[PDB]
């Protein structure tokens, strides 16, 4: 090991495992999985119905006190039946700790809005709806945040093209900015970078 290798922390790993067991015991109705990564990060995979209870428990419970919502985002995996992975990152100042809560949904199933638990979620949820098209029920004001007015589609979906479908230019005949189908003078050049040799034997999958 020595100099070039990142060191381990067994104390934090044990503490996070114990707290994950604690949370899983307290909420068997919604918790589906608990994980602790090799770099000491605790993840809790829950059922979509438990978004409001679990988060509430992690905010108001005396032993958790995860009072800060550091980040809320989505991850798109097209190969899954439930396309979108909703990820919450929470920080507890009282116990100087961080936790991750992960749930799932598809294009047509709404997720409960968390603005009653964390106000900071508001814009975050908007961004998810803007960037992936996931609808959040009971959002006080849900609408586009990052994209242009009238923009069609959700650009952070993996099947959305990198350059989109339309581009803008000023047209002098109508004396205004117009949108037209995209044409690129130089097409973006796709690179095939993956090596045909396996890099990490520890992550090898069964041959099916």
């Amino acid at each position: 090991t020595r100099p070039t290798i990142r060191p381990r922390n067994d104390v934090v790993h044990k503490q996070l495992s114990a707290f994950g067991q604690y949370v899983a015991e307290i909420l068997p109705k919604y918790v589906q999985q608990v994980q602790v990564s090799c770099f000491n990060e605790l993840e809790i995979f829950i059922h979509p119905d438990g978004v409001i209870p679990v988060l509430t428990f992690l905010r108001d419970h005396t032993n958790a006190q995860f009072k800060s919502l550091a980040d809320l985002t989505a991850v798109d995996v097209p190969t899954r039946q439930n396309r979108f992975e909703i990820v919450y990152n929470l920080l507890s100042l009282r116990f100087n700790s961080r936790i991750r809560v992960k749930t799932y949904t598809d294009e047509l199933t709404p997720i409960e809005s968390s603005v009653t638990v964390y106000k900071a979620a508001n814009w975050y949820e908007r961004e998810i709806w803007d960037m992936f098209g996931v609808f959040f029920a009971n959002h006080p004001d849900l609408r586009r945040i990052l994209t242009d007015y009238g923009f069609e589609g959700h650009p952070f979906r993996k099947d959305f093209p990198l350059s989109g479908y339309v581009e803008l230019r000023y047209d002098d005949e109508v004396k205004r900015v117009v949108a037209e189908p995209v044409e690129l003078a130089q097409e973006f050049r796709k690179f095939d970078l993956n090596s045909p040799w396996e890099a990490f034997p520890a992550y090898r999958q069964p041959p099916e």
């Binding site: 609408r143 007015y149 009238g150």
Partner: protein
């Protein structure tokens, strides 16, 4: 059963009701949009365009998809009413600058390789 959670409507009838309310709102709004944005089109053109945008999705049979379409249309209406959109955003519905692309086989064959 397929065990699917609704968004707003249980079946297609309440979805059609919501569609009708959204259509009423857009139809009422069109003259105000024409006046405020100072558009060269008439109210008839705007209402015909609203009808065309509504009929673009007339084949949908899933109440959840209809609910999401109504949500998006309400978002667009709220954008239009508050003058968050500009004249260019409204006029993008009419494609006044794009040349008319032919539909018959012969013209596509003459022009290029696209099907």
């Amino acid at each position: 059963g397929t065990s699917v959670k609704p968004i707003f409507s249980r079946d297609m009838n309440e979805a059609k009701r919501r569609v009708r309310e959204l259509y009423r709102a857009w139809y009422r709004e069109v003259p105000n949009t024409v006046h405020l944005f100072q558009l060269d089109i008439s109210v008839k053109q705007g209402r015909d365009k609203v009808r065309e945008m509504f009929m673009k999705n007339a084949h949908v049979t899933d109440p959840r998809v209809v609910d999401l379409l109504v949500i998006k249309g309400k978002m667009e209406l709220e954008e239009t009413i508050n003058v968050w959109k500009q004249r260019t955003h409204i006029m993008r519905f009419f494609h006044e600058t794009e040349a008319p692309r032919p539909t018959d086989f012969l013209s596509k064959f003459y022009v290029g390789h696209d099907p």
